[PDB]
Design an enzyme around this catalytic site. Structure first.
Site, PDB file in Angstrom:
ATOM      1  N   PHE A  43       1.881 -43.955  -3.124  1.00 60.25           N
ATOM      2  CA  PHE A  43       2.327 -45.205  -3.793  1.00 60.25           C
ATOM      3  C   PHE A  43       2.937 -44.909  -5.173  1.00 60.25           C
ATOM      4  CE2 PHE A  43      -2.173 -44.496  -4.799  1.00 60.25           C
ATOM      5  CZ  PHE A  43      -2.167 -44.551  -6.171  1.00 60.25           C
ATOM      6  N   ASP A 159     -10.141 -54.681   3.662  1.00 61.97           N
ATOM      7  CA  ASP A 159     -10.283 -53.201   3.519  1.00 61.97           C
ATOM      8  C   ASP A 159     -11.427 -52.858   2.571  1.00 61.97           C
ATOM      9  OD1 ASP A 159      -9.965 -50.507   4.296  1.00 61.97           O
ATOM     10  OD2 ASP A 159      -8.505 -50.241   2.690  1.00 61.97           O
TER      11      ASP A 159
HETATM   12  C1  EAE Z   1      -7.709 -44.576  -9.278  1.00 65.23           C
HETATM   13  C2  EAE Z   1      -8.772 -45.629  -9.446  1.00 65.23           C
HETATM   14  N1  EAE Z   1      -8.300 -46.997  -9.764  1.00 65.23           N
HETATM   15  C3  EAE Z   1      -7.354 -47.648  -9.024  1.00 65.23           C
HETATM   16  C4  EAE Z   1      -6.705 -47.109  -7.931  1.00 65.23           C
HETATM   17  C5  EAE Z   1      -5.725 -47.797  -7.145  1.00 65.23           C
HETATM   18  C6  EAE Z   1      -5.108 -47.067  -5.984  1.00 65.23           C
HETATM   19  O1  EAE Z   1      -5.398 -48.975  -7.370  1.00 65.23           O
HETATM   20  S1  EAE Z   1      -7.183 -49.308  -9.556  1.00 65.23           S
HETATM   21  C7  EAE Z   1      -8.442 -49.098 -10.755  1.00 65.23           C
HETATM   22  C8  EAE Z   1      -8.995 -50.058 -11.603  1.00 65.23           C
HETATM   23  C9  EAE Z   1     -10.026 -49.706 -12.460  1.00 65.23           C
HETATM   24  C10 EAE Z   1     -10.503 -48.402 -12.461  1.00 65.23           C
HETATM   25  O2  EAE Z   1     -11.587 -48.097 -13.240  1.00 65.23           O
HETATM   26  C11 EAE Z   1     -12.075 -46.745 -13.216  1.00 65.23           C
HETATM   27  C12 EAE Z   1      -9.947 -47.432 -11.628  1.00 65.23           C
HETATM   28  C13 EAE Z   1      -8.923 -47.786 -10.750  1.00 65.23           C
END
Ligand code: EAE
Ligand code: CL
Length: 349
Positions: A43, A159
């Site tokens: 993505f 999901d």
């Molecule tokens: C990569 C983790 N991550 C995301 C991943 C995706 C694919 O969206 S969105 C997100 C929001 C908070 C966070 O806190 C730690 C982490 C967080």
């Protein structure tokens, strides 16, 4: 290393994959300062930033590739996140919603409040030693509460899995590692589908996927209840309930663990090749047959203790894992389940 915001924010180029060429110290919107990498994928990338318009608070900034299909998938995620935010003005329902989004030179960017480790990564870091029942109970309660809100606003996540459930703060004591605060938030609304919208046929990740989706009978909110039941089992034992990668074997596992599939679900499916005279086609004697018969037992056989609180957990999981989505407990009903009589007054509020 430290760069200026005006300069860094205007100095921009993509690579051959349509990723934004960037590194630690780069800026976006003369606002977001990149201080780390959180994750990456087809993505785009997720970078940790300080938000200089908000006292340098930490954010997870998702930066989507300059590629049409990823741009459009992000635009939809953003429209779902706006609709959830507008229904939950003040954020009482435990979703990781956006703090910001913008188009940075063809890159869709979505800012989130930075939380802790997801419930999978915490478990892995504990050598897959399961969560104690009190933690499972609190986490169960919060999932029911969060998704109930979405469900009664004509939305389905589709999901839910341990990696999409995040600890607000994943700081732990050593007693096995034991998280200090079991507060969680539900992430990753990219696939979320309103009642009136087109339902893609195959939703959920394999382990969390319900029988009505495998048999292509139509799905709705009950899909999320099945996923939550599978998640609670994995929190409680530390391994997935359904260790499989094939539909037929998956359905057989469901029978070994939960009992027979309702005959009207077998009658209605296009997938008749999985059945003979209304029973699942399965060789008990093959290599997979031997594995499934040794490893997939009635759900109650996975109880670690016999006390009532454990009976109550297993009764709620049974109800969340009903074959027939019309008979599956709803989350409004789940919140009244006596399993939740065991919450502290603090957890309950
Ligand atoms: C990569 C983790 N991550 C995301 C991943 C995706 C694919 O969206 S969105 C997100 C929001 C908070 C966070 O806190 C730690 C982490 C967080
Ligand atoms: Cl087919």
């Amino acid at each position: 290393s430290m760069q200026s915001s005006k300069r860094s924010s205007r100095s921009v180029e993509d690579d051959k994959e349509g990723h934004l060429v960037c590194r630690i110290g780069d800026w976006l919107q003369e606002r977001y300062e990149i201080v780390g990498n959180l994750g990456e994928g087809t993505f785009g990338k997720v970078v940790e930033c300080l938000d200089h318009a908000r006292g340098k608070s930490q954010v997870a900034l998702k930066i989507i590739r300059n590629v049409g299909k990823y741009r459009e998938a992000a635009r939809l995620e953003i429209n779902v996140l706006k609709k959830i935010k507008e229904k939950d003005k003040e954020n009482k329902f435990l979703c990781v919603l956006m703090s910001d989004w913008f188009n940075f030179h063809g890159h869709m960017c979505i800012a989130f409040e930075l939380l802790g480790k997801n419930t999978f990564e915490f478990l892995k870091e504990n050598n897959f030693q399961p969560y104690p029942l009190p933690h499972v109970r609190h986490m169960a309660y919060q999932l029911c509460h969060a998704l109930r809100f979405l469900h009664e606003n004509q939305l389905t996540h589709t999901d839910l899995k341990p990696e999409n459930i995040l600890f607000v703060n994943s700081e732990f004591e050593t007693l096995e590692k034991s998280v200090k605060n079991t507060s969680i938030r539900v992430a990753d609304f990219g696939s979320a589908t309103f009642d009136h919208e087109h339902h893609t046929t195959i939703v959920a990740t394999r382990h969390y996927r319900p029988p009505e989706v495998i048999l292509e009978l139509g799905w709705a909110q009950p899909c999320d209840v099945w996923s939550i039941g599978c998640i609670l089992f994995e929190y409680y034992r530390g391994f997935t309930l359904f260790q499989t990668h094939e539909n037929r074997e998956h359905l057989v596992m469901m029978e070994k663990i939960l009992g027979p599939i309702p005959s009207h679900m077998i009658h209605r499916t296009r997938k008749q090749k999985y059945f003979y005279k209304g029973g699942l086609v399965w060789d008990e004697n093959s290599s997979d047959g031997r594995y499934v018969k040794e490893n997939c037992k009635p759900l109650k056989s996975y109880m670690l203790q016999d006390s009532l609180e454990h009976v109550q957990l297993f009764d709620l999981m049974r109800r969340m894992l009903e074959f027939d989505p019309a008979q599956r407990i709803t989350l409004a009903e789940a919140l009244l389940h006596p399993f939740f009589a065991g919450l502290t007054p603090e957890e309950r509020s």
